[PDB]
Amino acid sequence: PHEIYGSMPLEQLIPIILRQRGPGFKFVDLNEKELQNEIKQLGS
């Protein structure tokens, strides 16, 4: 599963992140502290 995520260039990853986060939320609005936060919840 992670093979596709790790094998795609950022030029195609950006639209994927944009569609995952929905409209309005830019690809850069994500916070690193917030990022490690949801990483912590998903790791549980």
């Binding site: 992670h2 093979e3 790790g6 094998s7 260039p9």
Partner: protein, 56 residues
């Protein structure tokens, strides 16, 4: 700094963990299945999958 940055980018482009899971999956998939059944099935599909040149 620029040129070493593209060197870093191109090195990162060539793959880490994903390749080793894929190699693992290959190894247990190969170990699980015996070659006898695979060769028998290949021989039995050789007639169907391969279109002979004389089949009008």
């Amino acid at each position: 700094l620029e040129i070493l940055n593209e060197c870093h980018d191109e090195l990162k482009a060539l793959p880490l963990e994903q390749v080793e899971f894929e190699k693992n999956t290959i190894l247990q998939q190969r170990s699980k299945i015996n070659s006898t059944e695979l060769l028998d099935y290949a021989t039995k599909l050789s007639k169907f999958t391969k279109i002979p040149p004389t089949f009008d």
